[PDB]
Amino acid sequence: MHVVICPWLAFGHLLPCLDLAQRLASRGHRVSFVSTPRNISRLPPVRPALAPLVAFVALPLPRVEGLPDGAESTNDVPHDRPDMVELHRRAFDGLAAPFSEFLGTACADWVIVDVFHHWAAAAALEHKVPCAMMLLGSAHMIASIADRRMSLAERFSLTLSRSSLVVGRSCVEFEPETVPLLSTLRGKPITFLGLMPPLHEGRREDGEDATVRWLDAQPAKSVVYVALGSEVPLGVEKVHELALGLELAGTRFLWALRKPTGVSDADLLPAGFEERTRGRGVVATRWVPQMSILAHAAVGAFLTHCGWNSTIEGLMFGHPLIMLPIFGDQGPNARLIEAKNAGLQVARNDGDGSFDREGVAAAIRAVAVEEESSKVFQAKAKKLQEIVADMACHERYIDGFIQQLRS
């Protein structure tokens, strides 16, 4: 088959879509990976053996006054500048005509579109190509969308209405409580393509990255890795509470931190924090090799925002989770793993959802420091790792997904 894949302009979408493209090409399918040029330029390289089977189709983002040239992804357009989020949405929707032109002559068997691709779904209908909508999260999250407790909701609803199939990233082995209960979303069949845990070969990072050389100098399971994915906002006041919570709990840490918009370098972290913690902690204000870090012997707990990629990556390497969900599917993901006893959420105010250094330190202590509770979280995370890291199981689910596309 020729499968056209259209990821949302966000690294939590681009990365698993690139892995799915290579899983399809590995089984002898042709893939057109449709995105914007700077986003494509920032992706890990395709395996040389698959080079002719994964075609990158670069559609330039239209120019929108006030949207920087090159600001193509949610990693570039900050959530703390909602006016720019809106300009990026307008630019994204401007891809409609170039995409429809491409699809007309593509000889596509399937279009697989992401959560806001209402125009790509419209093009699939126009060109009589079946359309699958990606909702590459947990079964628990898909259940939440079915029973929740243009606007974003309208963009999603319209994309779903024009699709024939909804694609989740889980399996009955991981969510036996939920997967058997799900049949349809807006009357469209739900299919699960497994957890699709990533591969080092697919995420080609540097094993000589400064963060990995620092981890090399720390003893086994001694380091709390801290990362909140590629896009969620965390304002400077919240950065300081997270910093001081890490300091007070006293563990070694490696922290991949994105800067809030318009915050000075001198203001980013608490006064003297970097000096006081220099001996036990590293803050990297750049993209880090997360797969190399989570695969590293020095990492024990993972302080995660519970993005679905990070949840799967943490558990595939048997890390218990210290969970700080920010938006979207992160709350449901955090509650799902808490219910599996493999991590604990940082306390949040029942009112404004705020956290402080005491809540951060208490969660770190419970998961990573206190002998008895940390031992149990570690054992429970290892039980989940048995399911998450079963690569043969998740490859069988990809085969099943391809059979669904045929049927």
Ligand SMILES: C=C1C[C@@]23CC[C@H]4[C@@](C)(CCC[C@@]4(C)C(=O)O[C@@H]4O[C@H](CO)[C@@H](O)[C@H](O)[C@H]4O)[C@@H]2CC[C@]1(O[C@@H]1O[C@H](CO[C@@H]2O[C@H](CO)[C@@H](O)[C@H](O)[C@H]2O)[C@@H](O)[C@H](O)[C@H]1O[C@@H]1O[C@H](CO)[C@@H](O)[C@H](O)[C@H]1O)C3
């Ligand atoms: C009904 C809904 C289900 C929902 C679940 C999460 C989901 C959706 C966003 C669809 C795409 C996948 C996914 C997993 C996601 O987070 O992707 C993720 O979506 C992100 C964008 O959110 C992307 O960037 C990521 O790449 C992507 O993975 C999905 C659709 C909209 C959602 O609800 C809407 O959440 C907005 C959040 O905004 C977000 O709020 C954040 C603060 O919390 C801001 O930082 C952020 O800029 C803003 O977009 C909020 O501002 C609106 O008020 C609210 O809509 C209102 O909901 C009410 C209750 O259901 C209704 O009664 C109202 O009629 C309805 O208008 C949220």
Ligand SMILES: O=c1ccn([C@@H]2O[C@H](COP(=O)(O)OP(=O)(O)O)[C@@H](O)[C@H]2O)c(=O)[nH]1
């Ligand atoms: O410094 C970073 C930050 C993130 N990631 C990767 O970016 C993805 C983040 O996706 P997730 O669903 O966890 O969160 P999102 O960014 O969508 O909020 C994961 O595959 C991470 O491995 C990375 O490699 N380095």
